[PDB]
Scaffold this motif. Structure first.
Motif, PDB file in Angstrom:
ATOM      1  N   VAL A  26      -7.438 -15.268   1.971  1.00  0.00           N
ATOM      2  CA  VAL A  26      -7.341 -13.819   2.077  1.00  0.00           C
ATOM      3  C   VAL A  26      -8.714 -13.179   1.942  1.00  0.00           C
ATOM      4  CG1 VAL A  26      -4.962 -13.794   1.196  1.00  0.00           C
ATOM      5  CG2 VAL A  26      -6.925 -13.528  -0.390  1.00  0.00           C
ATOM      6  N   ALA A  27      -8.779 -11.886   2.247  1.00  0.00           N
ATOM      7  CA  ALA A  27      -9.985 -11.095   2.043  1.00  0.00           C
ATOM      8  C   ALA A  27      -9.702 -10.088   0.949  1.00  0.00           C
ATOM      9  CB  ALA A  27     -10.403 -10.389   3.312  1.00  0.00           C
ATOM     10  N   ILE A  28     -10.546 -10.087  -0.073  1.00  0.00           N
ATOM     11  CA  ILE A  28     -10.362  -9.227  -1.230  1.00  0.00           C
ATOM     12  C   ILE A  28     -11.446  -8.150  -1.313  1.00  0.00           C
ATOM     13  CG2 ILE A  28     -10.163  -9.150  -3.730  1.00  0.00           C
ATOM     14  CD1 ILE A  28      -9.499 -12.180  -3.569  1.00  0.00           C
ATOM     15  N   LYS A  29     -11.083  -6.904  -1.019  1.00  0.00           N
ATOM     16  CA  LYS A  29     -12.021  -5.794  -1.154  1.00  0.00           C
ATOM     17  C   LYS A  29     -12.005  -5.288  -2.590  1.00  0.00           C
ATOM     18  CE  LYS A  29     -11.664  -1.775   1.271  1.00  0.00           C
ATOM     19  NZ  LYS A  29     -12.169  -0.404   0.963  1.00  0.00           N
ATOM     20  N   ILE A  30     -13.148  -5.385  -3.265  1.00  0.00           N
ATOM     21  CA  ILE A  30     -13.247  -5.003  -4.673  1.00  0.00           C
ATOM     22  C   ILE A  30     -14.046  -3.715  -4.866  1.00  0.00           C
ATOM     23  CG2 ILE A  30     -14.080  -5.665  -6.949  1.00  0.00           C
ATOM     24  CD1 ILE A  30     -13.451  -8.448  -6.407  1.00  0.00           C
ATOM     25  N   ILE A  31     -13.466  -2.789  -5.616  1.00  0.00           N
ATOM     26  CA  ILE A  31     -14.072  -1.486  -5.817  1.00  0.00           C
ATOM     27  C   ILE A  31     -14.195  -1.182  -7.309  1.00  0.00           C
ATOM     28  CG2 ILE A  31     -13.847   0.968  -5.358  1.00  0.00           C
ATOM     29  CD1 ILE A  31     -12.141  -0.012  -2.854  1.00  0.00           C
ATOM     30  N   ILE A  41      -5.457   2.505   0.902  1.00  0.00           N
ATOM     31  CA  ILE A  41      -4.346   1.695   0.412  1.00  0.00           C
ATOM     32  C   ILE A  41      -3.025   2.193   0.975  1.00  0.00           C
ATOM     33  CG2 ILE A  41      -3.000   1.054  -1.616  1.00  0.00           C
ATOM     34  CD1 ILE A  41      -5.675   1.306  -3.197  1.00  0.00           C
ATOM     35  N   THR A  42      -2.860   3.510   0.987  1.00  0.00           N
ATOM     36  CA  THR A  42      -1.640   4.130   1.480  1.00  0.00           C
ATOM     37  C   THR A  42      -1.366   3.766   2.937  1.00  0.00           C
ATOM     38  OG1 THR A  42      -1.966   6.028  -0.010  1.00  0.00           O
ATOM     39  CG2 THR A  42      -0.413   6.301   1.813  1.00  0.00           C
ATOM     40  N   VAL A  43      -2.379   3.928   3.784  1.00  0.00           N
ATOM     41  CA  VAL A  43      -2.227   3.623   5.200  1.00  0.00           C
ATOM     42  C   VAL A  43      -1.954   2.131   5.403  1.00  0.00           C
ATOM     43  CG1 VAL A  43      -3.402   3.491   7.424  1.00  0.00           C
ATOM     44  CG2 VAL A  43      -3.611   5.567   6.028  1.00  0.00           C
ATOM     45  N   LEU A  44      -2.733   1.290   4.724  1.00  0.00           N
ATOM     46  CA  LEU A  44      -2.579  -0.163   4.836  1.00  0.00           C
ATOM     47  C   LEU A  44      -1.178  -0.598   4.447  1.00  0.00           C
ATOM     48  CD1 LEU A  44      -5.897  -1.655   3.411  1.00  0.00           C
ATOM     49  CD2 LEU A  44      -5.036  -1.890   5.736  1.00  0.00           C
ATOM     50  N   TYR A  95      -1.549  -6.517   4.919  1.00  0.00           N
ATOM     51  CA  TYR A  95      -1.873  -5.982   3.602  1.00  0.00           C
ATOM     52  C   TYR A  95      -1.078  -6.723   2.521  1.00  0.00           C
ATOM     53  CZ  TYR A  95      -1.998  -2.690  -0.303  1.00  0.00           C
ATOM     54  OH  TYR A  95      -2.127  -2.121  -1.546  1.00  0.00           O
ATOM     55  N   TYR A  96      -1.776  -7.319   1.564  1.00  0.00           N
ATOM     56  CA  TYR A  96      -1.121  -8.104   0.531  1.00  0.00           C
ATOM     57  C   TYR A  96      -0.755  -7.266  -0.701  1.00  0.00           C
ATOM     58  CZ  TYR A  96      -1.670 -12.731   2.647  1.00  0.00           C
ATOM     59  OH  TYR A  96      -1.539 -13.864   3.432  1.00  0.00           O
ATOM     60  N   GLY A  97      -1.559  -6.260  -0.993  1.00  0.00           N
ATOM     61  CA  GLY A  97      -1.310  -5.427  -2.153  1.00  0.00           C
ATOM     62  C   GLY A  97      -2.589  -4.958  -2.811  1.00  0.00           C
ATOM     63  N   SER A  98      -2.478  -3.906  -3.611  1.00  0.00           N
ATOM     64  CA  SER A  98      -3.606  -3.484  -4.429  1.00  0.00           C
ATOM     65  C   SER A  98      -3.298  -3.801  -5.883  1.00  0.00           C
ATOM     66  CB  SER A  98      -3.897  -2.000  -4.229  1.00  0.00           C
ATOM     67  OG  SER A  98      -4.085  -1.727  -2.849  1.00  0.00           O
ATOM     68  N   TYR A  99      -4.311  -4.287  -6.594  1.00  0.00           N
ATOM     69  CA  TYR A  99      -4.150  -4.781  -7.958  1.00  0.00           C
ATOM     70  C   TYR A  99      -5.204  -4.180  -8.879  1.00  0.00           C
ATOM     71  CZ  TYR A  99      -1.203  -8.296  -5.694  1.00  0.00           C
ATOM     72  OH  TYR A  99      -0.235  -8.924  -4.943  1.00  0.00           O
ATOM     73  N   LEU A 100      -4.801  -3.866 -10.105  1.00  0.00           N
ATOM     74  CA  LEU A 100      -5.713  -3.310 -11.099  1.00  0.00           C
ATOM     75  C   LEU A 100      -6.187  -4.397 -12.061  1.00  0.00           C
ATOM     76  CD1 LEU A 100      -6.896  -0.487 -12.015  1.00  0.00           C
ATOM     77  CD2 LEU A 100      -4.950  -0.381 -13.611  1.00  0.00           C
ATOM     78  N   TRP A 109      -8.519  -4.313  -6.816  1.00  0.00           N
ATOM     79  CA  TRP A 109      -8.576  -5.317  -5.752  1.00  0.00           C
ATOM     80  C   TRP A 109      -7.687  -4.910  -4.593  1.00  0.00           C
ATOM     81  CZ3 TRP A 109      -8.839 -11.102  -7.592  1.00  0.00           C
ATOM     82  CH2 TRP A 109      -9.847 -11.221  -8.554  1.00  0.00           C
ATOM     83  N   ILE A 110      -8.250  -4.773  -3.397  1.00  0.00           N
ATOM     84  CA  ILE A 110      -7.418  -4.517  -2.229  1.00  0.00           C
ATOM     85  C   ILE A 110      -7.388  -5.777  -1.370  1.00  0.00           C
ATOM     86  CG2 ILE A 110      -7.027  -3.087  -0.196  1.00  0.00           C
ATOM     87  CD1 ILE A 110      -8.472  -0.842  -1.546  1.00  0.00           C
ATOM     88  N   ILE A 111      -6.227  -6.423  -1.317  1.00  0.00           N
ATOM     89  CA  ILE A 111      -6.136  -7.766  -0.748  1.00  0.00           C
ATOM     90  C   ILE A 111      -5.509  -7.720   0.633  1.00  0.00           C
ATOM     91  CG2 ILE A 111      -5.361 -10.127  -1.119  1.00  0.00           C
ATOM     92  CD1 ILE A 111      -5.249  -9.569  -4.026  1.00  0.00           C
TER      93      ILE A 111
END
Ligand SMILES: [Cl-]
Length: 288
Positions: free
Chosen positions: A40-45, A61-64, A75-80, A86-88
């Protein structure tokens, strides 16, 4: 707020590997879904080093989360996790269409194939009342076997019954429609203009005005006649570009209509043929 499905503790379900990308947002990493061993690709903010575009990061995140298409990065999910979100997303290892341009020019079969898949993505998004607003070869990603998908929904907009047009100044200047630069009322037809610029980009290697400072194109684009595709290209390719690059948005065709364009029908082939381009880039990159 629109984070109802925000999840917790990503490192139980995913393994973070090496870094692969960067942007205004933060950083992107390769990873593993430990349930499937898919990559997967993990976008970290960094939420604290983030400001103002916090409002954007949510929108993204909403659109994805609302997209379900083989032509849009899964879109796999967003995680805190502590201070980090993490936006996966789906990982695509073939390179962007812009990457595939680095070693040399494309032929019209490759251009048509890529445009056809972009069009299926745009048709999906626009049928969902979504506008990508940053269509360009760099945001068209390929799998290593030639599947083509749209990526980077960081400035994507949504239309609704009460909001039938957008006004926001977003996108990448060389690819922006004139009505977006003017911040006039616009819709999915803005993506069709950007697609025309992307077609020139795929054919020529770069968009119009690419040697100019982007600030200059902010007056040049609304003012000048629309770009055309010049050079030794087929008439249907030139007409494809022309159809997209109409100053008046209502005269641009829809993505659905463009899927039936002579250029697409006559020249697009199987996406698996794109592995040739993917292999060319890998060879080229290994010897840089
Ligand atoms: Cl892949």
């Amino acid at each position: 707020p629109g984070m109802q499905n925000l999840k917790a503790d990503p490192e139980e379900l995913f393994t973070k590997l090496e870094k692969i990308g960067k942007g205004s947002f933060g950083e992107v990493f390769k990873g593993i879904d430990n349930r499937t061993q898919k990559v997967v690709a993990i976008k970290i903010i960094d939420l604290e080093e983030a400001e103002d575009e916090i409002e954007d990061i949510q929108q993204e995140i909403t659109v994805l989360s609302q997209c379900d298409s083989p032509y849009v990065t899964k879109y796999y999910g967003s995680y805190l996790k502590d201070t980090k979100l993490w936006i996966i997303m789906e990982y695509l290892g073939g390179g962007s269409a812009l990457d595939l341009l680095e070693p040399g020019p494309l032929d019209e079969t490759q251009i048509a194939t890529i445009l056809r898949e972009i069009l299926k993505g745009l048709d999906y998004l626009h049928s969902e009342k979504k506008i990508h607003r940053d269509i360009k070869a760099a945001n068209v990603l390929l799998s290593e076997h030639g599947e083509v998908k749209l990526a980077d929904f960081g400035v994507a907009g949504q239309l609704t019954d009460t909001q039938i047009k957008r006004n926001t100044f977003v996108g990448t200047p060389f690819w922006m429609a004139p009505e977006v630069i003017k911040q006039s009322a616009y819709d999915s037809k803005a993506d069709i203009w950007s697609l025309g610029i992307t077609a020139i980009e795929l054919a020529r290697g770069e968009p119009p005005h690419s040697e100019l400072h982007p600030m200059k194109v902010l007056f040049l684009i609304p003012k000048n006649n629309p770009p055309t595709l010049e050079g030794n290209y087929s008439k249907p390719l030139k007409e494809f570009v022309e159809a997209c690059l109409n100053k008046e948005p209502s005269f641009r065709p829809t993505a659905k209509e463009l899927l039936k364009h002579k250029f697409i029908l006559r020249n697009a082939k199987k996406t698996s043929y794109l592995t040739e381009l993917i292999d060319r880039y890998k060879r080229w990159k290994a010897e840089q």
